[PDB]
Amino acid sequence: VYSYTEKKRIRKDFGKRPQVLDVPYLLSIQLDSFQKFIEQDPEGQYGLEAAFRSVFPIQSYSGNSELQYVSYRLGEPVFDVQECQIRGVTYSAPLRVKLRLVIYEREAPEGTVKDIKEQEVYMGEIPLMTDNGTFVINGTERVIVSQLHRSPGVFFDSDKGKTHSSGKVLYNARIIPYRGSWLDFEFDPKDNLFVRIDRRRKLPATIILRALNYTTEQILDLFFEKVIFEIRDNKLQMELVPERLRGETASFDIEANGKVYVEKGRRITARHIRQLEKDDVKLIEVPVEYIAGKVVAKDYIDESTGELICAANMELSLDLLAKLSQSGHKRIETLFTNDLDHGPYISETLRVDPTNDRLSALVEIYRMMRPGEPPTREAAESLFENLFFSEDRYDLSAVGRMKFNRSLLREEIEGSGILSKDDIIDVMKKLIDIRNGKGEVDDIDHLGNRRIRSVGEMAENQFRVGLVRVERAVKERLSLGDLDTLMPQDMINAKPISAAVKEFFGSSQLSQFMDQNNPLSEITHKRRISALGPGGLTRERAGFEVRDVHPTHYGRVCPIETPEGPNIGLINSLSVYAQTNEYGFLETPYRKVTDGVVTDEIHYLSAIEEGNYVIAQANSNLDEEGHFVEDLVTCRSKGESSLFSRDQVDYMDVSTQQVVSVGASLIPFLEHDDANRALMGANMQRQAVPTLRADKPLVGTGMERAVAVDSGVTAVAKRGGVVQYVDASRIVIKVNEDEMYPGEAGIDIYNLTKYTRSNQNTCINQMPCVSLGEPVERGDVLADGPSTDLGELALGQNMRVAFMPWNGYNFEDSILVSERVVQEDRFTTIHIQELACVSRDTKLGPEEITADIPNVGEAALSKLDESGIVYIGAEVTGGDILVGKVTPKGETQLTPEEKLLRAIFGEKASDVKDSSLRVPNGVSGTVIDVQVFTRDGVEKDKRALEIEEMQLKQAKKDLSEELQILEAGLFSRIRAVLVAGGVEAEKLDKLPRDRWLELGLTDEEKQNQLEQLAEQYDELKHEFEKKLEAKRRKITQGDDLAPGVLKIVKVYLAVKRRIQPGDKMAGRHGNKGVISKINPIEDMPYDENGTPVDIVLNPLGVPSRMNIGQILETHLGMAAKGIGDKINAMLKQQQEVAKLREFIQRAYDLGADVRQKVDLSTFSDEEVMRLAENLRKGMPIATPVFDGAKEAEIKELLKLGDLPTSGQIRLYDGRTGEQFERPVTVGYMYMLKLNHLVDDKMHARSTGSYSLVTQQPLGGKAQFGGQRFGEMEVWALEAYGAAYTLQEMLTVKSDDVNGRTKMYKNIVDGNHQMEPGMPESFNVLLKEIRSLGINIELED
């Protein structure tokens, strides 16, 4: 059951694994994000609602009045997308916000409602996204790239053993919010915790705790375990917990009930702990020596004196114990420390702590944040309260809170965006646990720790950024009176918001001009992920491990498509099936496996969730009921891969192309290519240039239709129907009544795009692919965009190729091309260019565009029309005039000489100067379009009037079509009702429509119904008259331009470029080269039938590169062309349709248990003949990336076409007629033409313009610059010993001015000799050094 656009030409598929999930819409990532940004939200979680409710309500200091927000809305754009692109403006919509002002009375309880006034206010413009995920900013299409940044939350890291020379590892923990400051906890080489804020000066860790309402007793309670001391009047009989003794050796006699379980000099073992636990040993007799250095827990004071005995954080001593013994203290508390666990770190830091109370810590914090500034209590306390605990200054977001709680093992996902005491305490405890070997550090490259941020979120952030400034202005303004007449309209300004939005959309790092070589370039650009930009990494100070393929990239990021060079590893592409969470984490689909039966349930798993399961591969063979085959399957689990039993499997991949991007999925036989060559080919595939005609690959992968249709370059039927009108520039579809809305004429009109410029100055051109009267369905292809062929992606041409060396003309990646390739314009491209002439206004009068240029000949003005604008269709070269303009010179003193000049040669030649627009030198083409924009108030010229007439005719055409359909329907109804009254059949038919209007009847309801129908007819006529009037008004409206600008004229030129030596060609497998020669057709190798080859490639480039995919592609292309040749031979000698369909069914039935079923019994003979006519140049074939065709199937298909099974034939030398001594591999390969034309590379210079400061030649081809002769070339010349050549390079060719002039004069004079001097840059250096107060000079 194939669609109409697919039934014309069906691609034979060699894949063998059934599909369980279709490829999604490829541009979801942009559309979903911007829809979240723009749509209304009942809550305030996303979009403009979240930004508005983040700021409003805004209230004054006195509380007397308040400004509040109610709702927002977006109006319809002024222009359409095509109009915006043509004119050069931004496609956007206006934002309207309903604010309200409330007044509170004074000397009243709370806020008394004196008056509330609500008003709608204009906030600015917001650019809108088109149907293809693009923005039209100033008439050019742009893409905003998604960003891969670090997720908010808490992250634990450690140095790898580098920060100190001792090899000890130092741990740290950072808190990363969405907005706010950074909070780092770090370990010192002396095991002292420290706290850092915003990478500032290191501070003691406990300063934060003391800033909070915390005391040393409470700190030690939080971070330490107690030890209880009872002095039972005999050697302080101690209580013991057995597990506390692990890792220790007895320092005394440890006994219970007179039995010493562990003696002095004996280490405590596990069995001794077992004995203690069994005996419940509590009373332990220890000497004073066991308490010689233990740290006291709390403060103790004698009950007699009452004075302080020992401070907190104090290690005991014999004298202190003796003193406290007589103080009547029997219960004492101490800390508990060890080495394998429960290490002392907080107590030592408290020892290093210089502060004592909360106020001192706050003052210290103020000193750290503000250096030298004399602090007070109020400023410090306010600053510390606002640093982390103010909603307006610190936000942790919702994803940040989720990650924070998930890191500390809390059962709640929700929370607040601010910190608290518990959060900091838990972070410190987790860091301590990791220090004690009771935790694991994070991995900052795991894709569970990296978040995706798209266009909507960035736009929301920028909008909030503008709203804060508007809020500040409102608060400053609202603090006054005069409220009896004030309205919110005079309260806010459009500039602080519209300026920010415009800046973000037009001048951000991630806002870029769209890549537009071909549809694949656009698709790749829109699915790109970047690690750079604001809030991201930098190209130099990024690292080495972030540029690496992490195991969690499987199914989420393509491991093959990345730009080689500086940005390798930092720019990535999305995978085919990859999605994002509601939090922004990439996830991928899997099939759930239950009871050993692979089901069809699809679950999207993220990197965190995926690591807990066992996931099979898509290569696994299954039965017909879903069960596996072998008792062992290859699976991934916990980041590795191995064999698992049939029952240990949890999931399974959906497809074999799940791990690649769109660009890499279009390479046939990818599994036979080395990864470097695959990367190079994937990059090269998206810089191909469209040609005059498209050509489907004839060896594909089955992904061509998806890329063709989801790119938006084609015309797609919105509703089903019949092609009522077809033309080279428009299509009109007559919609089925099953899909027509009530009360309308059902027609769809598509206006195709003809010869339009792209961002890369190439041609964009749509062509119809349907015929008159044929039926179409919803979603079918009606027109083909650039590089598309019947709805399939077609980036290149099918070339007949041979692999052999040919006299050294394919030496080292050179390409030998036939002359027949050039004769047929197979690689000919169209390039379009735009130029503009602006007639402005200046002080000495207005500039004028005219054809009467004072001092040019009649021949130069031959191609300008009566208005001074070049004709459409003219051929122009360098220096020709496109638009004629003059500029006023002003007025002079009017000496008698000037008066004589005015008298003789006319007064116009003395008032104006020639400032026309000319074709740049070295540029040709044909004028294909001129567009004129005139400011309002000024008068239109003949050219603009003709253009407006054309546009008005174009609009009137569609209006007339719809009106004609409705009129015909109404007249049909009128006549049908009229006959029923008793009117003659033939008389009514011969009566014209005007006569049908005027006719009488009986006095029944027939007359009333006829009157109603006539009134409806008149109303219809009036409505269409109104529509036409409005369209004419819009077309003929004047234009608003920048101040001073009076007129704008735009001219478009078009040229055709042909292939030539020096142009770059490539295949899809990383095999690039340069054309070296164009060979006459009778010099090319030919086979036994006299058929020559198109291209000869060197076979020595295959074995060292290991891109074996090209050889297999050549063999399969040969087979496909053989099938096409058989079909063509049958078609030429007209044979019966039965034989044709028999052979085509045989061709489609080939293969070893493929998944594609084609049945030709359900085809009519017309469909069979049309299909055979579409297959006569070769039957196209699809081979998926990792589910392709085997060698046996290729050999079978070769046998079907009566071709040698080895793929190698006998060739002959065209120059001598002699047979080459070995068989040669001849086939068909898909070649591309890359945008590296030699026309844009060649450059030369003898003398030109120089820099003003250094007096050296400038750089670049566009400036007619010179070539740089750097240090390494100087070293080479020194190594040779060529002193005079070097002195020529340094002096008389760069910056010795007198030497320059004298050398030129000598060369023209025939005397090759130089008189060198001193370069100017050395004098500049002397001046710059003397400007530093240093006396440097030449001498003697």
Please list every residue from 1314 through 1333 that binds another protein, using CB under 8 A.
1314, 1319, 1321-1325, 1327-1332
Nearer to another protein, 264 or 539 (CB): 539
Does residue 843 belong to the site contacting another protein (CB under 8 A)? yes
Q: How far apart are CA 301 and CA 308, in angstroms?
A: 5
Which span sits near another protein by CB under 8 A: 318-326, 373-381, 717-725, 1300-1308?
1300-1308
- Contact call for residues 186 and 196 (beta carbons, < 8 A): yes
Nearer to another protein, 149 or 502 (CB): 502
Number of residues binding to another protein, judged by CB under 8 A: 142
| E-only strand ranges, 1059-1198 | 1064-1066, 1072-1079, 1095-1097, 1181-1182
Nearer to another protein, 60 or 910 (CB): 910
Strand partners, 113: 104
Which span sits near another protein by CB under 8 A: 452-460, 661-669, 743-751, 802-810?
802-810
Nearer to another protein, 1174 or 1256 (CB): 1256
Which span sits near another protein by CB under 8 A: 209-217, 356-364, 370-378, 893-901?
893-901
Q: How far apart are CA 269 and CA 247, in angstroms?
A: 8
Q: Write the DSSP string, 653-668.
A: BS-TTTTS-TTGGGST
Does residue 160 belong to the site contacting another protein (CB under 8 A)? no
Q: Which of 105, 373, 866, 891 binds another protein (CB under 8 A)?
A: 891
Q: Which of 551, 746, 846, 1201 binds another protein (CB under 8 A)?
A: 846
Two tokens, residue 232: 């039972």
Q: How many CB atoms lie within 10 A of CB 772?
A: 10
- The candidate with the shortest Cα–Cα distance to 1124, out of 1, 15, 12, 14, is 12
Taken as a whole, the chain contains a residue count of 1340
End-to-end Cα, the chain, rounded Å: 97
Does residue 293 belong to the site contacting another protein (CB under 8 A)? no
Does residue 1080 belong to the site contacting another protein (CB under 8 A)? no
Does residue 879 belong to the site contacting another protein (CB under 8 A)? no
The single-letter code of the amino acid at 985 is: A
Nearer to another protein, 853 or 1181 (CB): 853
Site string for another protein, 476-515 (x = CB under 8 A): ------------------xx---x-------x-x--xx--
Which span sits near another protein by CB under 8 A: 223-231, 787-795, 820-828, 845-853?
845-853
Q: How far apart are CA 109 and CA 1149, in angstroms?
A: 89
Least distance between another protein and beta carbon 1321 (Å): 4
Residues 97 to 126: which contact another protein by CB under 8 A? 122, 125
Q: Which of 44, 247, 805, 920 binds another protein (CB under 8 A)?
A: 805
Least distance between another protein and beta carbon 1308 (Å): 5
Does residue 1174 belong to the site contacting another protein (CB under 8 A)? no
Least distance between another protein and beta carbon 729 (Å): 24
∠ at Cα 1269 (1266, 1271), nearest 5°?
Answer: 155
Which span sits near another protein by CB under 8 A: 416-424, 610-618, 626-634, 1256-1264?
1256-1264
Residues 898 to 927: which contact another protein by CB under 8 A? 899-901, 903-905, 909, 913, 915
Q: How far apart are CA 335 and CA 868, in angstroms?
A: 97
Least distance between another protein and beta carbon 787 (Å): 22
Two tokens, residue 120: 């709608």
Least distance between another protein and beta carbon 1058 (Å): 12
Q: How far apart are CA 943 and CA 257, in angstroms?
A: 118
Does residue 1270 belong to the site contacting another protein (CB under 8 A)? yes
Does residue 1033 belong to the site contacting another protein (CB under 8 A)? no
- Contact call for residues 896 and 904 (beta carbons, < 8 A): no
Which span sits near another protein by CB under 8 A: 306-314, 357-365, 843-851, 1223-1231?
843-851
| E-only strand ranges, 248-366 | 254-256, 259-262, 283-284, 295-296, 300-301, 308-310, 314-315, 331-335
Q: Which of 315, 1269, 1317, 1318 binds another protein (CB under 8 A)?
A: 1269
Strand partners, 310: 300
- Where is 979: in which H helix or E strand? helix 942-980
Does residue 1236 belong to the site contacting another protein (CB under 8 A)? yes
> How far, rounded to the nearest angstrom, does the alpha carbon of residue 1013 sit from its chain's CA centroid?
57
Site string for another protein, 732-761 (x = CB under 8 A): ---------------------------x--
Least distance between another protein and beta carbon 88 (Å): 4
Does residue 1254 belong to the site contacting another protein (CB under 8 A)? yes
Q: How many CB atoms lie within 10 A of CB 1270?
A: 8
Q: How many C-alpha atoms does 885 have within 13 Å on its Cβ side? A: 20
Residue 999 makes CB contacts below 8 A (sequence gap 6+) with 978, 983, 991
Nearer to another protein, 74 or 909 (CB): 909
- Contact call for residues 179 and 460 (beta carbons, < 8 A): no
Q: Which of 239, 739, 852, 1039 binds another protein (CB under 8 A)?
A: 1039
Least distance between another protein and beta carbon 82 (Å): 14
Does residue 1137 belong to the site contacting another protein (CB under 8 A)? no
Nearer to another protein, 569 or 1204 (CB): 569
Which span sits near another protein by CB under 8 A: 327-335, 785-793, 1183-1191, 1242-1250?
1242-1250
Q: Which of 812, 1015, 1023, 1082 binds another protein (CB under 8 A)?
A: 812
Q: Which of 1044, 1129, 1139, 1191 binds another protein (CB under 8 A)?
A: 1044
The single-letter code of the amino acid at 1076 is: S
Does residue 1312 belong to the site contacting another protein (CB under 8 A)? yes
Least distance between another protein and beta carbon 79 (Å): 8
Nearer to another protein, 44 or 1044 (CB): 1044
Does residue 613 belong to the site contacting another protein (CB under 8 A)? no
Question: 1042-1081 b/e with 16+ CB inside 10 Å = b?
Answer: eeeebbbbbbbbbeebebeeebbbbbbbbbbbebbeebee
Q: How far apart are CA 5 and CA 989, in angstroms?
A: 42
**SS3 for 872?**
coil
Nearer to another protein, 611 or 1099 (CB): 1099
Nearer to another protein, 25 or 811 (CB): 811
Q: Which of 110, 280, 595, 897 binds another protein (CB under 8 A)?
A: 897
Residue 192 makes CB contacts below 8 A (sequence gap 6+) with 204, 205, 345, 348, 349, 352
Please state at what angle helix 455-478 crosses helix 28-38, rounded to 10 degrees.
20
Place of tokens 């990818």: 670
Does residue 49 belong to the site contacting another protein (CB under 8 A)? no
Q: State how beta strands 925-934 and 1047-1057 pair.
A: antiparallel
Q: Which of 1028, 1074, 1081, 1150 binds another protein (CB under 8 A)?
A: 1074
Least distance between another protein and beta carbon 482 (Å): 21
Does residue 73 belong to the site contacting another protein (CB under 8 A)? no
Q: How far apart are CA 1076 and CA 1082, in angstroms?
A: 18
Does residue 865 belong to the site contacting another protein (CB under 8 A)? no
Nearer to another protein, 625 or 1328 (CB): 1328
- Contact call for residues 146 and 530 (beta carbons, < 8 A): yes
The single-letter code of the amino acid at 338 is: N
